[PDB]
Amino acid sequence: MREIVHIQAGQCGNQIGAKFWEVISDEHGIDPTGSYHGDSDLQLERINVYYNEAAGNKYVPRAILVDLEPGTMDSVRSGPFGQIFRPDNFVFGQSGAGNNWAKGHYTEGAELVDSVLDVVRKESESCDCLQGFQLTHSLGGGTGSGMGTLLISKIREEYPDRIMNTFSVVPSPKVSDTVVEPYNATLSVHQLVENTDETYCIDNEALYDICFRTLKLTTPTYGDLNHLVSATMSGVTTCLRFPGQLNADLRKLAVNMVPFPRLHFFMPGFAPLTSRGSQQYRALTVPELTQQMFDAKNMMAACDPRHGRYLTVAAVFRGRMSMKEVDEQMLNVQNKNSSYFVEWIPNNVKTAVCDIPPRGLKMSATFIGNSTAIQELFKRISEQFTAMFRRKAFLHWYTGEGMDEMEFTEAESNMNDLVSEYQQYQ
Amino acid sequence: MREIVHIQAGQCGNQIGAKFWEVISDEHGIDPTGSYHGDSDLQLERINVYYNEAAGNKYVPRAILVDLEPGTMDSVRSGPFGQIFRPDNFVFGQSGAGNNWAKGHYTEGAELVDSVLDVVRKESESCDCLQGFQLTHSLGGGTGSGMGTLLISKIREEYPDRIMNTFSVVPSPKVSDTVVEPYNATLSVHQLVENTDETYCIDNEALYDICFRTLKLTTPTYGDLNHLVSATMSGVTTCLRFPGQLNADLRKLAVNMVPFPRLHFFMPGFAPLTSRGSQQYRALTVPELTQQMFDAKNMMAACDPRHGRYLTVAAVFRGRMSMKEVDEQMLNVQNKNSSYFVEWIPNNVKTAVCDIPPRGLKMSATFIGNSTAIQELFKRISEQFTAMFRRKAFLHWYTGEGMDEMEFTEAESNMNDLVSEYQQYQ
Amino acid sequence: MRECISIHVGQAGVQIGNACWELYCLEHGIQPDGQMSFNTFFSETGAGKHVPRAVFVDLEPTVIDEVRTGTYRQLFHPEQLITGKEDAANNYARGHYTIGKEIIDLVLDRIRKLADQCTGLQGFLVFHSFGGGTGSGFTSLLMERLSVDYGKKSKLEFSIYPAPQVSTAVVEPYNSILTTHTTLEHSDCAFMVDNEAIYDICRRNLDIERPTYTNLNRLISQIVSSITASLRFDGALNVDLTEFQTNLVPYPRIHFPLATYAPVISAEKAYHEQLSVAEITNACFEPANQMVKCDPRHGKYMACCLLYRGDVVPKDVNAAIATIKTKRTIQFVDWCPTGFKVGINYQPPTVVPGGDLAKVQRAVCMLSNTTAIAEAWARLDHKFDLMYAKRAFVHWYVGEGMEEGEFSEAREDMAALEKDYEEVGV
Amino acid sequence: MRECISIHVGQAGVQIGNACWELYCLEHGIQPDGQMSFNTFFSETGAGKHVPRAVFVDLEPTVIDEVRTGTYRQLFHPEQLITGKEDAANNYARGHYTIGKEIIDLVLDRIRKLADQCTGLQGFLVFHSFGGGTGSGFTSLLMERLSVDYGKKSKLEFSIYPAPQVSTAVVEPYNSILTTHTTLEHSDCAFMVDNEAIYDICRRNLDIERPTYTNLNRLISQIVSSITASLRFDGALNVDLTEFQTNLVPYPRIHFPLATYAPVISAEKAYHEQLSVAEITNACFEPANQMVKCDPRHGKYMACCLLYRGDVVPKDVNAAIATIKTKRTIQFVDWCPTGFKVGINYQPPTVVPGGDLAKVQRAVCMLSNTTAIAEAWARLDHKFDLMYAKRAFVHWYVGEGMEEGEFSEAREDMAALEKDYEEVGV
Numbered sequence A, B: 001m002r003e004i005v006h007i008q009a010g011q012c013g014n015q016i017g018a019k020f021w022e023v024i025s026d027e028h029g030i031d032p033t034g035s036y037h038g039d040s041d042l043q044l045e046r047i048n049v050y051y052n053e054a055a056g057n058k059y060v061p062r063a064i065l066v067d068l069e070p071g072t073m074d075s076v077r078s079g080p081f082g083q084i085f086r087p088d089n090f091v092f093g094q095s096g097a098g099n100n101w102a103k104g105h106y107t108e109g110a111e112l113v114d115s116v117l118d119v120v121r122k123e124s125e126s127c128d129c130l131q132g133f134q135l136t137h138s139l140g141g142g143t144g145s146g147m148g149t150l151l152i153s154k155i156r157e158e159y160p161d162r163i164m165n166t167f168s169v170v171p172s173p174k175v176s177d178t179v180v181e182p183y184n185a186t187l188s189v190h191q192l193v194e195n196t197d198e199t200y201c202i203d204n205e206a207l208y209d210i211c212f213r214t215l216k217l218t219t220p221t222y223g224d225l226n227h228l229v230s231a232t233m234s235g236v237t238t239c240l241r242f243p244g245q246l247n248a249d250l251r252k253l254a255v256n257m258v259p260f261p262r263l264h265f266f267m268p269g270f271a272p273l274t275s276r277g278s279q280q281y282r283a284l285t286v287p288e289l290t291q292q293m294f295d296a297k298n299m300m301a302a303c304d305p306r307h308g309r310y311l312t313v314a315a316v317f318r319g320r321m322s323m324k325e326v327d328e329q330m331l332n333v334q335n336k337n338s339s340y341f342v343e344w345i346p347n348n349v350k351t352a353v354c355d356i357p358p359r360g361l362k363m364s365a366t367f368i369g370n371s372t373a374i375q376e377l378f379k380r381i382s383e384q385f386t387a388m389f390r391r392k393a394f395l396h397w398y399t400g401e402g403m404d405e406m407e408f409t410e411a412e413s414n415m416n417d418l419v420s421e422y423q424q425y426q
Numbered sequence C, D: 001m002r003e004c005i006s007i008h009v010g011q012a013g014v015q016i017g018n019a020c021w022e023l024y025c026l027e028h029g030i031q032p033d034g035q036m037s038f039n040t041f042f043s044e045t046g047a048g049k050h051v052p053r054a055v056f057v058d059l060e061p062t063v064i065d066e067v068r069t070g071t072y073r074q075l076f077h078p079e080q081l082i083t084g085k086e087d088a089a090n091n092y093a094r095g096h097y098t099i100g101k102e103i104i105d106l107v108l109d110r111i112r113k114l115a116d117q118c119t120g121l122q123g124f125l126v127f128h129s130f131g132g133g134t135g136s137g138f139t140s141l142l143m144e145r146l147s148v149d150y151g152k153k154s155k156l157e158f159s160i161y162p163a164p165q166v167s168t169a170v171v172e173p174y175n176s177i178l179t180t181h182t183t184l185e186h187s188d189c190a191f192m193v194d195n196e197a198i199y200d201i202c203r204r205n206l207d208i209e210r211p212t213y214t215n216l217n218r219l220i221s222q223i224v225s226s227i228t229a230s231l232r233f234d235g236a237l238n239v240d241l242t243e244f245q246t247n248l249v250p251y252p253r254i255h256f257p258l259a260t261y262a263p264v265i266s267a268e269k270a271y272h273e274q275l276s277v278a279e280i281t282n283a284c285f286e287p288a289n290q291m292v293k294c295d296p297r298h299g300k301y302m303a304c305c306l307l308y309r310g311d312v313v314p315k316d317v318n319a320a321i322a323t324i325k326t327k328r329t330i331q332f333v334d335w336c337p338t339g340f341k342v343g344i345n346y347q348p349p350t351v352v353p354g355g356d357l358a359k360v361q362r363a364v365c366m367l368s369n370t371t372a373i374a375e376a377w378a379r380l381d382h383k384f385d386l387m388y389a390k391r392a393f394v395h396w397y398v399g400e401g402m403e404e405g406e407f408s409e410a411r412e413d414m415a416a417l418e419k420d421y422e423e424v425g426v
C-alpha cells in the first residue's frame, strides 16, 4: 500500500500523538496490545497505511517518538500505548532543551536526530510505497518546535518527492504558554515553511471555546483537547484508509488546497459540534453538517474566518449522503457567503466523500480552510516576537547556543514576506 | 410548508408562550418530550408550520425565548416545556431592565438582540417558506415592551415582506401593574405601530371578568388567564394548520382585516364562553356561537365594543357547520346591529371556517373585532402618560438611560394621530 | 372524440371540481383511480386508467393537498395537480402579477402538453370564484395566455357571483370588478351563480335545513354535467360548445348568462308531483328557482337554452315552449325576436350517492341572458365604489404596484357594460 | 460477431463501468461470474464463463480493489483489472507523463492481447471524467497509443463534462482544457454529460430527493446500453459505431455530441402518462430533459440521432419526427439541411433491479450536436483563463515539466474550437 509515516515531536507532539494513535487503533478495531480485533473487512483492509504487521495480529504503528526529555515518552508508554509502540521507535536522550529552539534543533537535538533518521530509514525500507510523514509539534515548545524542524529538513532531503506534513500548535493569541514562545515559533516557521508540504495551525484557546462553550464541556483537559486534534487528523486519512464516492488521496487533497507554493497553512474545521444536551434538537443533515462546517465557532484555529477571503476549502465528508445534496448545499453556501471567497478561484468549494463515518457519528465531516484571515496568527507571533527582539529579551539563551541575530532577522523577514503574500491574494 | 416563527418576550411574553406552546402541542398530539404521538393524520399533516423535526419524532417548536432576566426562562424550562424547547433558543442575559423600556430595548437589550437575531436567521434558513413571526409581550412590562420592539425593528428590516405580529398585553384601564406602565406602553407603541403588520390588544381586567363572572371561575390565576390568550392565538393559526371549507390563511385574514395601514389592532373574541354548570342549559348552534361572539362580555380587551363602529370583524369558526346557517346568522346579526358597523364597508362581516374543532369543543369560534371603540384603551394610556409626563414623574430612570423628552413627545403625538384616525373613521 | 379542456382555479374552483369529477366518473362507471364517449374528457392510458382533462391550480397548497390525499388522488396526474407555496391572500395584484407569474408558466406547459394529447380540442372550462385571490387575479392572467395559445377554442369560465347580501371576504367587491374587467377581453362566456339564492333553493325546494359547500357543490356539478352531456352523450339535438357561444352571446361583450336547473326537489316531494316536460319547463321560469338572486321579472330575456335530459320528446318540448311563450309574464327583448334555442339531450340526469336530489326521469338546465342582470352589476359597481371612495384596503394593492385610476377605469368599464345591458333592453 | 473494445479510466470511469457491466449481464441473463450476440462484448470461455471486453485502469488502487472484492470480481480478468500504486492526484502532467508512463505500457499489452482474442474488432469506449488525474492525463496518453496501434477502429470516449456551477476539484478547469486539447487529435467522438443537469433531472422527472453517484450512474449506463444495443441486438435499422462517427461528426474536430434519454420518469408518473412514440420524442427535445445543463434554445442543432428501443414502429417514428420538424421552435443549422439520422432499435430498454426508472415499453436516446455547446466552452475557457491569469496551482504542473505557453496554446486551441462552433452556426 501507500504508507504514511508519523513523527511525534515534543511534550505536545508526543501527547497529541498518544491519543491520535489510540483513536486510529479504535478506527481499525485494534486492541491496546497491537493485536487487530475488528469485525468488518474495512477495519483492516488498508491497515497497512499506518500499521506494519509484526506477526499474527501484531500491528505496529508506523511512528517514531522523538524527545530529548525522557519523562515524556516514559509517561506515554506508562499509558495504554507503550506496548503498541515498538521500543526501536523510542528515540530519546536525557537532557531537556528547556524551551530553547537553539538547543532542541540546532545543538543537542542533532545527536538524537542521527539515531532517529536511522529508524526512519528502517521504516521507509519496510514501506511499499512511501506516501509521507506526519509530525506532531508545538510551534512554541522548544523540542517540539526545534527538533521537529531539523528532522524535517533531513527527511525532506532524503525523500523529496514525498508528502511531509506537520501538526504544529500555534501560540494562543491571548495567552502565551512560554515567555519566549514567539522566538520558538518564528524560528521554527522560518525553516518549517520552506521544508514542508503542509502545516496545520491550531490554537488551544480556540479549542477551549469549542470544548467548553460549544460542547459545553465542564473541564477541558488536554486529553479532551487532543481528542479534537486527533479528530481532524483521522478524517484526512480516511481519504486513504477507506473507500468512498469521491476518494481523494492525501496528495490529491494537498494538490487541490495549495494554490501557491508556501501557503500551506490550514485551519481544520469540524462537524458536528454540539453538546449532548442539544443533540436531540437538531438533525444531522448535509445542510446541518455544512452549517456547522461554516461556523467561526467551529474553527479550531483562533482566527475569525470572515476576515479576508477563503483561498480554498476542502470539505471532506464521512458517511453516506447524496452527491446532489452535498454539491448543492456547498454551492448554496458559496453563493450566500460569496463575499468570503477569493474571486481568483471559480468554484471556491472543494469536496470529497468517504463512505465510512467516524466512531458512531452517522454523518461527520472535517473542514480544511485556507483563508487569508490566518495572517492574524502570523501577526500575533510577529508582533510579540518583534517587541522582544528589539530589547533582546531572553536573547542570551539562544545566542548562548550560538544563534545569530540575523538568523532571527531573516526568520521574521520571511514571516513578513509570508503575510505579504496573504495580503496580495486578499 | 409555510412556517411561522414566534418570539416570546418578557415575563408576560414567556409565561403566555409557555402555555401557548403547551396548547398547540396538545392540538397536534405532541407529548412533553417533543415526540409526536397523535392519532389522526391531521395531527401532524401541517405540523411543519410550528415544528422542525429534529429526528425520529423530535419536534422542535419554532420559537425563540428572549429575556434579560434569567429566572423567567429558568422557571419555564423547569416546567413541562424545557425539553420541548431547544437550548439554542434560550437567549438570555443576567440583568433585569427593571421595567425600563430604555434599558430593555435601547441600551442593554441590544447586546442580547444580536445573539437572538442569529438564532432567528438559523430558523429562517431552516424554514421553507417563511410566513412570519409571532412575539409575546406585555405592552407595559419593561423587557416585554421594549426588547420586543427592538427585535421587531431588526427582523422587519431583514424580512420586510413577511407577516410579523405581536401579542401585547395592553395595560388594564382601572389598575396599573407598573407605575410607569403608561411610559413603557406609549414608547413601545410608537415603534410597535410602525414596525408591525398586526398587534393584538388584550387586558387582564377583561380576562378577569370573563374568567370569574362569565366562566364562574373561582380563582383566576395567570395559568387560566393565559389559557384564554393561548386560545385565540390557536384559532387564527387553524386557518393555516388545518383544512376547511373556507381556508383563510393568516395573510388573507390580515389583508381582509386591515382597511387602512397602521390600524391593525385587534380585540379577540371568544366562543363559547359559559361555566360548566350552565352548559347543560344551552345548545351550541351557530346562532348560539355567534351570539357569544357578539357579546361585550366575551370581548377579551377591556373595551365596550358598542362604542363607535366595527371597521372589520373576522369570524373564524372551528368545527363542522352549514355555510348557509353561518352566513345567514352573521347577516342577521349585521342587520339587527347595523348601528355598530362602519357604513364604509358594505358587508361588514367577514368569515372563515376550518373543519376541525379545538380540544373537544364541537363548535368553537374566535372573533377578531377591530372597532373604533378601541381608541378608549389608547386614551387610557395617553391620559395616564400625559399626567406623569407633565410632572416628569419617574423621568430620571429613562433619561438616566439617555432617552430624550422629545422621544416621549413624538411617541404620544403618534398615539394621538392614531386615535385621530380612529375618530375620522368613526 | 372531440375533447375539451377543464381548468379549476382557486379553493372554490377546486372544491367544485372535486365533486364535478366524482360525478363524471359516476356517469361513465369509472372507478376513483381512473379504471374502466368519455374520451371527450378522459385519456385512456395503457391500463384502462382513464385520466381526466383537467388542471388544478392552487397557490394555497392545503386544498389540492387534501385532494392529493383524497380518494380521487389516484385518478389525477401529479403533474395536473399544481400547487404553489402561498396564496394571493385575496389580492388580485399578486394573483395576476406578483405571485401568479411563478406558476402561470408551469401550468401553461401542462396545458400545451395536454393539448398535444388531444386531436379534437374543443372548449376549456375554468372553475373559480370572482373574489378569491387565487381564483380572481390568477384567472385573468391565465385566460390571457390561453387566448394567445389557442384563441380559437371555446373559452368557458365559471365564476361564482358574489352573493348580493352575503359575503365572506371584505374586499371581494374589489376583486370581482378588477378580475372581471380584465377577463372581459379574454373570455367568450362567463357563468355566474349565487350561493345565497342557491341556499334559498336548497331550503325551499329540496327541503334542506342548513346548506353548506358540500351539497351546494353537488348541485352545481349536475348543472355543468348537463352542459357537457350534450357533448358526452347521444342526444337528438346535440349541442357543441361552439354553438353555446353562437347562441348565448347576443353581443360581443355581454356574455354573462345565468343558469338554473329543474327539478330541484326532495325525493319525498317527487311523489306528490308528476314532473312532465311542461311541468319542469314551467318551473324553470319560476323566480323562486332562480339560481342567481335576481328576480327575472326585473328585466327582459335577451336569450335561451334548454338542455333536456332523459325522457323528453320533441313535441312535449315544443308544446311546453308553446305554453311558456304563451305566458306573456315572461318578457323578452324586442331586439331578440324568437331566440329560444333549445338544446335537447336524451341521456338522463344522474344522482350522486349520498346526494340530496330526487331521481327524476327528465330534467332540464335553463340558461338565459336577461337585462335584469344589470341589477347584479349595480350592486357590485356600487359596493366597489363605496370602498374605493375611502380607499379602504387601497394601500394593499397600490403597494403591490396597482394604479389609482386603473381601478377607476376598470369600474368605468363595468359601468359601461351595465349601460350596455340598458342598451339591449331598449 | 463484430465486437468492441471498452476502456474504463479513472474513479468515474471505473464506477460507471461497475454499473454498466452489471446492466449488460442483466441484459443477456449472465451471472456475476460470467456464467451463461453478447459475444460482441464477451468472450465465451471453455465453461460458459463469458468474460467482458473491458480493461479497468486505476492508479489509485482503492477503487478497483473494491471492484476486485465486489461481486463482479468473478466476471473480470485479473489481468484486466490493472491497478497502480499512487494516483496522479488531479495532475495531468503525471497522468499523461510522469506516472502514466509506468502502466500505459502494461495496459496496451492487455489491449493488444485482447485485440487478438477478437476477429471483428469494431469500436472502443473509454470511460473517464475530464478533470480527475487518472481520467484526464492518462486518457490522452492512452488514446494516442490506440490511434497508433489501431487507428482505423472507432475511438469512443466518455468524458463527464465538469458541471457548470458545481465542482469537486478546484483545478478541474485546468485539467479539462489540457486533457481535451490533447485528446482532440486522437478521438473520433467525445461525449459529455453534466452531473448537475442530471441531478436536476433525477429530481424533476424521476421525483428523486437527493441524487448520488450510485443511481446517477445507473442512468448513464442505460444511455450507453442503447448505443450498444444497436450492435448487440436485432433492430430494423441497426446502427454500427462507424455510422455514429459518419453522422454525428459534421466537421473534423467538432465531434462533441451531447445526449439525453427519455422517458425519465418514476413508475408512479407512468400511470398518469401514455408514453407514445411521439410523446417520448417530444420529451427528447424538452430543455428540461437536457442532460447537459445547456438549454437547446441557446443555439441551433448541427446533427441528430434516435436510438429507439422497444415497441416502436417506423411510421410512428416518421410521424413523430414530422411533428418535431414541424415544431419550428427547434432551430437547426442552415449548414445541415435535413440531417436527422434516426437510429431505431427493436430490443426494449431494461430496468435495473433496485433501480429508480419506470419500466417502459419504448424508449429513446436522443443525441445531438448544437452550436449552444459553445456556451459550455465559454465557461471552461474562462474558468481556466481566470486561474491561469493567477497561476493558481501553476507551480504544481510546471514543477512536473509542464510549459507556460503550452497551457496558453492549449487554451488557444479550445478558443479556436469554440470559434469553430460559431463558424458552423453561421
Ligand SMILES: C=C1C[C@@H]2CCCC(=O)C/C(C)=C\C=C\C(=O)O[C@H]([C@H](O)NC(=O)/C=C\C=C\C)C/C(C)=C/[C@H](C1)O2
Pocket (backbone or CB within 6 Å): A023, A215, A227, A228, A230, A231, A232, A234, A235, A272, A273, A274, A275, A276, A279, A282, A358, A359
Ligand atoms: C475524530 C473524532 C473522534 C473523536 C473521538 C473521541 C471520543 C472520546 O473519547 C469521547 C467520546 C466517546 C465522545 C466525544 C465526542 C465529542 O467530543 O463530540 C464532539 C461534539 O461535542 N459533538 C457534536 O457537537 C455533535 C453534534 C452536534 C450537533 C449540532 C465532536 C468531536 C470532537 C468528535 C470527535 C471526532 O470524537
Ligand SMILES: C=C1C[C@@H]2CCCC(=O)C/C(C)=C\C=C\C(=O)O[C@H]([C@H](O)NC(=O)/C=C\C=C\C)C/C(C)=C/[C@H](C1)O2
Pocket (backbone or CB within 6 Å): B023, B215, B227, B228, B230, B231, B232, B234, B235, B272, B273, B274, B275, B276, B279, B282, B358, B359
Ligand atoms: C383555545 C382554547 C383551548 C383552551 C384549552 C385549555 C384547557 C384547560 O387546560 C382547562 C380545561 C381542560 C378546559 C377549560 C375550558 C375553558 O376555559 O372553557 C371556556 C369557557 O368556560 N367555556 C364555555 O363558556 C363553553 C360553553 C359556553 C356556553 C354558553 C372557554 C375557553 C377559554 C376555552 C379554551 C379554548 O380552552
Ligand SMILES: Nc1nc2c(ncn2[C@@H]2O[C@H](COP(=O)(O)OP(=O)(O)OP(=O)(O)O)[C@@H](O)[C@H]2O)c(=O)[nH]1
Pocket (backbone or CB within 6 Å): B245, B246, B247, B249, B252, C009, C010, C011, C012, C013, C015, C016, C060, C087, C088, C089, C090, C091, C128, C129, C130, C131, C132, C133, C134, C135, C136, C160, C162, C168, C169, C195, C213, C214, C216, C217
Ligand atoms: N360554491 C362554493 N363557493 C365557495 C366554496 N368555497 C369558497 N367559495 C366562495 O369563494 C369565495 C372565496 O374565494 P376562495 O375560492 O375560497 O379563495 P381562493 O380562490 O383560494 O383565493 P385566495 O385564498 O384569496 O388566494 C367566496 O365567495 C366563497 O363563498 C365552495 O366550496 N363552494
Ligand SMILES: Nc1nc2c(ncn2[C@@H]2O[C@H](COP(=O)(O)OP(=O)(O)OP(=O)(O)O)[C@@H](O)[C@H]2O)c(=O)[nH]1
Pocket (backbone or CB within 6 Å): A245, A246, A247, A249, A252, D009, D010, D011, D012, D013, D015, D016, D060, D087, D088, D089, D090, D091, D128, D129, D130, D131, D132, D133, D134, D135, D136, D160, D162, D168, D169, D195, D213, D214, D216, D217
Ligand atoms: N457520474 C459520476 N461522476 C463521478 C463519479 N465519481 C467521481 N465523479 C466525477 O469525476 C470527477 C473527479 O474525478 P475522479 O474520476 O473521481 O478522479 P480520478 O479519475 O480517479 O483522478 P485522480 O484521483 O485525481 O488521479 C468529478 O467531476 C466528479 O464529479 C461517479 O461515481 N459518477
Ligand SMILES: Nc1nc2c(ncn2[C@@H]2O[C@H](COP(=O)(O)OP(=O)(O)O)[C@@H](O)[C@H]2O)c(=O)[nH]1
Pocket (backbone or CB within 6 Å): A009, A010, A011, A012, A013, A015, A016, A069, A097, A098, A099, A138, A140, A141, A142, A143, A144, A145, A169, A171, A177, A178, A204, A222, A223, A225, A226
Ligand atoms: N494541544 C496541546 N497542547 C499542549 C499540550 N501540552 C503542551 N501543549 C502546548 O505546547 C506548548 C509547550 O510546549 P511543550 O510541548 O510542552 O515543550 P517541549 O517539550 O520543549 O517540546 C504550549 O503552547 C502548550 O500550550 C497538550 O497536551 N495538548
Ligand SMILES: Nc1nc2c(ncn2[C@@H]2O[C@H](COP(=O)(O)OP(=O)(O)O)[C@@H](O)[C@H]2O)c(=O)[nH]1
Pocket (backbone or CB within 6 Å): B009, B010, B011, B012, B013, B015, B016, B069, B097, B098, B099, B138, B140, B141, B142, B143, B144, B145, B169, B171, B177, B178, B204, B222, B223, B225, B226
Ligand atoms: N396575561 C398575563 N399578564 C401578565 C403575566 N405576568 C405579568 N403580566 C402583566 O405584564 C405586566 C408586567 O410586565 P412583565 O412581563 O412582568 O415585565 P418584564 O419582565 O420586564 O417584561 C403587567 O401589566 C402584568 O399584568 C401573565 O402571566 N399573564
Ligand SMILES: [Mg+2]
Pocket (backbone or CB within 6 Å): B247, C010, C011, C012, C060, C063, C087, C132, C134
Ligand atoms: Mg383558497
Ligand SMILES: [Mg+2]
Pocket (backbone or CB within 6 Å): A247, D010, D011, D012, D060, D063, D087, D132, D134
Ligand atoms: Mg480516483
